[PDB]
Design an enzyme around this catalytic site. Structure first.
Site, short mmCIF file in Angstrom:
data_model
loop_
_atom_site.label_atom_id
_atom_site.label_comp_id
_atom_site.label_asym_id
_atom_site.label_seq_id
_atom_site.Cartn_x
_atom_site.Cartn_y
_atom_site.Cartn_z
N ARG A 157 0.84 -1.19 0.00
CA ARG A 157 0.00 0.00 0.00
C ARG A 157 0.88 1.25 0.00
NH1 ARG A 157 -1.93 0.93 4.27
NH2 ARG A 157 -1.32 -0.86 5.56
N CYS A 203 1.04 -7.30 12.28
CA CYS A 203 1.29 -7.29 13.72
C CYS A 203 0.56 -8.42 14.44
CB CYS A 203 0.92 -5.95 14.34
SG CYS A 203 2.02 -4.60 13.90
N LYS A 257 -9.79 -2.93 1.59
CA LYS A 257 -9.51 -1.71 2.33
C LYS A 257 -10.40 -0.56 1.87
CE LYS A 257 -6.36 -3.74 4.61
NZ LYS A 257 -6.69 -4.00 6.05
MN LIG Z 1 -5.21 -5.50 7.25
#
Ligand SMILES: [Mn+2]
Ligand code: NA
Length: 622
Positions: A87, A288, A244
């Site tokens: 991105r 993460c 997204k």
């Molecule tokens: Mn994501």
């Protein structure tokens, strides 16, 4: 259908699959209007069939765009231009009449909470990109549904694209094809338009057979018009427009307008040894540990974790006051490196079939390879890197790009939750925040109230990852793990979250904050993580049940002494893992103060400022 004085408005004759006549009125106009603009050579209306899928993959293969991975069942590998690998937040814009509807006006003048572009500016950017952009190419029309068909929370879109790679991946990541068009009828749909920005004949050189236009890359969102418009990039987050773009940016704004939430959260179901099951949501930043947690293999005997989704949640309080969540996605677009039998066994079992890999290494027997895969290869087996070169362990650079991906069907997850497609959603009883903090933040704490819980989300900070353009491990603000994804003013977003407390019969989830990533003085991880995270989930479970397992600290509740099950670990440094330093937290609260003052300012809800003052005071007294 369309009137014309000549012969260049009706694109019927360029349709190579389906029919413009069979399309709903507004779908035809959307397709045809953009066909007139982009000038594709052909129009392919996607049907979502297995036949369509295999044939497109075979075509991409014969064109050198992808390779078949011979070791596996129906698995494929794409290698991108090194300029199109993640991105790009700086080229990701939202268009509104007033800038303040999109982002709070920062006191410093540079917003860390989104990017605004005027409608005037966008029109110029659009005219300088899209006219003629699909010349010599096929425009694929992708009818897609976000959420399981029949869900009251399900939303349909149409994506136009000149990229077969986008089509294949959208088949995995959404529900797509003829049945979606039939479900839509004359209803509303999010208008999604995508182009790689490389009309034929090519004006610039093609790198690694991957069409892209890095200089002109622009990922735009127009909420008022219900449009998403993306140019120059083929990478997942930029090109898979239901993910997204729609499910977070567009949908968060709709959510605020309509009284629900669209969040960067995994959903999981956890069962204890006493036969009780609870659903949890967790907002961690990109790369993460969401995917690891979502399909975790618990180390604690008698505990089971099942996966609803690993990325996005659409949530709404029902008439009963339960916060009900659905996964809008149909697949997992997971980070590859670090994935192994050790870190994520359930993912390993998922990605062995019907899976598209992007930017990973290839082994000579037709398998996949990456950093942290933790599988030795037989002598003789060689490695081709993501750069299409011969790679050896001593080559300094990685065999796989740090943000390389698998794109895999969710139905294939061995622990996919029985309710992952249920129209009513699953009831969320706990919400977890967290990121990568090498210092100061304890393993787990619990918010003191809803309002404090919203502050904890707002205050989130985490090391930069390879998911976007941010380099190094610089600790950045990432409130609610939504920094790259807010569809509207972050201040109003906080107000929206705070308003949930005043909703009739609302059964507010417990809010936690975790840190899997705390390190000691010489940089060693204090916590084994992965499957061992079930020990923290256990404590959360009991706390939801109202167990007396907590101790009050200035930052929230932590586990009592001996409350956490640490059997089979023993060596764990509990002193510094659970340690809370006055000095660190003095620094922490001042940093949060200045960030919120600058970045949120006039739009910061009073309740959040109040929580900030309260925390500062609790710290001053320690
Ligand atoms: Mn994501
Ligand atoms: Na390629």
């Amino acid at each position: 259908m369309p009137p014309q004085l000549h012969n260049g408005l009706d694109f019927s004759a360029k349709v190579i699959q389906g029919s413009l006549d069979s399309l709903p009125q507004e779908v035809r106009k959307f397709v045809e209007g953009n066909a007139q603009l982009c000038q594709p050579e052909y129009i392919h209306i996607c049907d979502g069939s297995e036949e369509e899928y295999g044939r497109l993959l075979a075509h991409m293969q014969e064109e050198g765009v992808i390779r078949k991975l011979k070791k596996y069942d129906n698995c494929w590998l794409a290698l991108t231009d090194p300029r199109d690998v993640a991105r790009i937040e700086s080229k990701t814009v939202i268009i509104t009449q007033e800038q303040r509807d999109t982002v709070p006006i920062p006191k410093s003048g540079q917003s860390q909470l989104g990017r605004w572009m005027s409608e005037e500016d966008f029109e110029k950017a659009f005219n300088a990109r899209f006219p003629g952009c699909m010349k010599g190419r096929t425009m694929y029309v992708i009818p897609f549904s976000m959420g399981p068909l029949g869900s009251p929370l399900a939303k349909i879109g149409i994506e136009l694209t000149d990229s077969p790679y986008v089509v294949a991946s959208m088949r995995i990541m959404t529900r797509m094809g003829t049945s979606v068009l039939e479900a839509l009828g004359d209803g509303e749909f999010i208008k999604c338009l995508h182009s790689v920005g490389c009309p034929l004949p090519l004006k610039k050189p093609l790198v690694n057979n991957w069409a892209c236009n890095p200089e002109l890359t622009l990922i735009a969102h127009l909420p008022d018009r219900r449009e998403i418009i993306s140019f120059g990039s083929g990478y997942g987050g930029n090109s898979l427009l239901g993910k997204k773009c729609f499910a977070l940016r567009i949908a968060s704004r709709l959510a605020k307008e309509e009284g629900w939430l669209a969040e960067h959260m995994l959903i999981l179901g956890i069962t204890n040894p006493e036969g009780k099951k609870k659903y949890l949501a967790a907002a961690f930043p990109s790369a993460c540990g969401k995917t690891n947690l979502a399909m975790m293999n618990p180390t604690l005997p008698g505990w089971k974790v099942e996966c609803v989704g690993d990325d996005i949640a659409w949530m709404k309080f029902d008439a009963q006051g339960n916060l009900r969540a659905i996964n809008p996605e149909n697949g997992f677009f997971g980070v590859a490196p670090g994935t192994s039998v050790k870190t994520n066994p359930n993912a390993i079992k998922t990605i062995q079939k019907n899976t598209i890999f992007t930017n990973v290494a290839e082994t000579s027997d037709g398998g996949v390879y990456w950093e942290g895969i933790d599988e030795p290869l037989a002598p003789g087996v060689t490695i081709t890197s993501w750069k299409n070169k011969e790679w050896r362990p001593q080559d300094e650079e990685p065999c796989a790009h740090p943000n390389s991906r698998f794109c895999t069907p969710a139905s294939q997850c061995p622990i996919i939750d029985p309710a992952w497609e249920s129209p009513e959603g699953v009831p969320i009883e706990g919400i977890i925040f967290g990121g990568r903090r090498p210092a100061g933040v304890p393993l787990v704490y619990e918010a003191l109230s809803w309002q404090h819980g919203v502050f904890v989300g707002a205050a989130m900070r985490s090391e930069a990852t390879a998911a976007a353009e941010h380099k190094g491990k610089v600790i950045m603000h990432d409130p609610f793990a939504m920094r790259p994804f807010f569809g509207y003013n972050f201040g109003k977003y906080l107000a929206h979250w705070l308003s949930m407390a005043h909703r009739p019969a609302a059964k507010l989830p417990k809010i936690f904050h975790v840190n899997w990533f705390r390190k000691d003085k010489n940089g060693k991880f204090l916590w084994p993580g992965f499957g061992e995270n079930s020990r923290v989930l256990e404590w959360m479970f009991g706390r939801i049940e109202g167990e007396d397992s907590a101790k009050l600290t200035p930052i929230g509740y932590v586990p009592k002494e001996d409350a956490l099950n640490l059997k089979g670990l023993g060596d764990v440094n509990v002193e510094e893992l659970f340690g809370i330093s006055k000095e660190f937290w003095e620094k922490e609260v001042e940093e949060i103060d200045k960030y919120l003052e600058d970045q949120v300012n006039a739009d910061l809800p009073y309740e959040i400022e109040r929580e900030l003052r309260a925390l500062k005071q609790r710290i001053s007294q320690m």
